[PDB]
Amino acid sequence: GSHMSDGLPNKKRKRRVLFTKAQTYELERRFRQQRYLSAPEREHLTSLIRLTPTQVKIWFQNHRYKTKRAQNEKGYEGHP
Numbered sequence: 001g002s003h004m005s006d007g008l009p010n011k012k013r014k015r016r017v018l019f020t021k022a023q024t025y026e027l028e029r030r031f032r033q034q035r036y037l038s039a040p041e042r043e044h045l046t047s048l049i050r051l052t053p054t055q056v057k058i059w060f061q062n063h064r065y066k067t068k069r070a071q072n073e074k075g076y077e078g079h080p
Contacts (some may be wrong), residue, residue: 019059023049028058031067 019027026048034041042056051059 019051020049023051024059025049027051027056030056030062031060031063 042053
């Protein structure tokens with residue numbers, strides 16, 4: 001059956017957005033087997049959680065900067 005709305009203009013020019021803890025998950029796993037996704041590396045994912053190739057790289061950017069804060073935190077956090 002037709003369970004996919006192809007009307008994209010029916011929406012306004014605004015609407016928050018996120019990712020299935022799943023996407024972001026595999027999509028986060030890629031960052032492991034690859035730290036510099038490209039045009040051919042990303043795609044591999046685009047097969048997984050469809051994060052369209054470029055969209056895949058566009059996401060890394062957001063993490064690239066934060067993926068650095070994680071290492072700064074990481075550890076047990078607190079005072080051992």
